[PDB]
Amino acid sequence: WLSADFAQERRWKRGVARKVVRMVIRHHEEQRQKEERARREEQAKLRR
Amino acid sequence: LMKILTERGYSFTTTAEREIVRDIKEKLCYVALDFEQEMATAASSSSLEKSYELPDGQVITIGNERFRCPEALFQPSFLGMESCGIHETTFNSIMKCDVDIRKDLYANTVLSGGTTMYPGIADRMQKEITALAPSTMKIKIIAPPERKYSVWIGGSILASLSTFQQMWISKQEYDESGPSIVHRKCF
Numbered sequence: 001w002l003s004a005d006f007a008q009e010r011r012w013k014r015g016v017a018r019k020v021v022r023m024v025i026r027h028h029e030e031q032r033q034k035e036e037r038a039r040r041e042e043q044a045k046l047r048r
Numbered sequence: 049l050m051k052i053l054t055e056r057g058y059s060f061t062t063t064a065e066r067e068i069v070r071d072i073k074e075k076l077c078y079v080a081l082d083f084e085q086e087m088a089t090a091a092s093s094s095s096l097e098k099s100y101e102l103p104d105g106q107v108i109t110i111g112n113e114r115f116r117c118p119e120a121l122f123q124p125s126f127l128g129m130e131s132c133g134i135h136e137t138t139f140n141s142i143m144k145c146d147v148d149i150r151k152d153l154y155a156n157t158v159l160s161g162g163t164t165m166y167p168g169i170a171d172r173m174q175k176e177i178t179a180l181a182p183s184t185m186k187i188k189i190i191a192p193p194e195r196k197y198s199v200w201i202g203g204s205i206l207a208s209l210s211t212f213q214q215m216w217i218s219k220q221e222y223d224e225s226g227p228s229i230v231h232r233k234c235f
Contacts, residue, residue, distance in 0.1 A: 046235055 049073050049117040058108050072100055072110060073117060079169040080115040083123075087112060118166050122176065135176030142181070154185040160198045164191065 050060045050069045060069050076098045080086035090096045090112035097111040120126045122133040132140060142153045157177060159170060170191035178187045192198060206212055217233045225232075 045232070 049077070049113060052113045052116055053110070056111070056113060068102060074165075076100065076110050077114050077117045078167040079118045079121070079172045081168060081171055081175065083115070083119055086115050090115075118169070121163075121169075122172065133176075135173055135180065138173070139177055139180040151185050154181055154187045157187070157189050158195075158198075159189060159191045160195045162196045165196050 049072065050066060053060055053069060053072070060066065086096070094111070096114065097109050098114065099107050100110055101107050116126070122135055124131040124133060138157060142150050142157075145153060154177065157173070159173065170189045174187060174189040177189070181187055194201065215233065217229050221229050221233075
C-alpha cells in the first residue's frame with residue numbers, strides 16, 4: 001500500500017509544481033495583458 | 049504652373065511673380081474630365097485659351113496649361129513624384145478600411161480645402177473612383193460650394209454645440225496635467 005501511496009504523492013506533487021509554474025506563467029502574461037488592457041482602454045477613450 | 053508658363057515663354061521666377069501665377073492658377077485652371085481629349089482639343093483648337101492681364105498691363109494668353117497644371121493631382125508623374133494621384137490616394141485609403149464600411153465611404157467621398165475649388169474636379173474624381181471601385185459600390189463625390197471654408201466651418205459647428213462644452217481642455221486640467229492632457233482630450 002505505502003509504495004503506491006509514495007508513488008502517487010510524488011507524481012501528484014510534481015504535477016502540482018508544474019501547474020503552479022503554468023499558473024504563475026498565466027498570471028505573468030496577465031500582468032502584461034494589464035498593459036494591453038490599458039492601451040485598449042485608451043483606444044476606447046479615443047472612440048468615446 | 050510657373051514651370052509650364054516659363055516653357056510657354058512667360059518666364060516667372062521671382063517671389064512676386066509666383067503670386068501672379070497663383071492668381072492665374074486660381075482664376076483660369078480647371079480639372080478636365082479627359083486629359084487626352086482635352087489636350088487634343090487644345091492642340092486642334094484655341095477655344096481653350098484665356099487672356100490674363102498682368103499688373104504692368106501686359107496681356108498673356110494661357111492655353112493647355114489651364115488643365116495640365118491641376119492634372120498633376122491625378123498624375124504626379126508630371127512633377128517627378130512616384131506617388132498616388134488624389135483619386136488613387138482616396139481609393140487605396142478606402143480599400144485599407146474594413147470591407148463593410150467601404151460602401152459608405154464610397155457613397156460619402158468629400159472634397160475640401162482651397163486646392164479643391166477647381167471646376168470639374170468633382171466629376172473627374174467621381175469618374176476615377178467609379179472606374180477603380182467595384183461596380184457594386186454606389187460612388188458619390190460631394191463638393192460643396194463653400195468647401196474652402198468647410199475646415200473652419202466644422203470647427204464653428206463643433207465648438208458652438210452645448211454638449212461639446214465638456215470636451216475642452218480647461219486651464220485647470222492643463223495646470224493639473226501639463227500639455228500631455230491634449231492626448232486625453234483632442235482628436
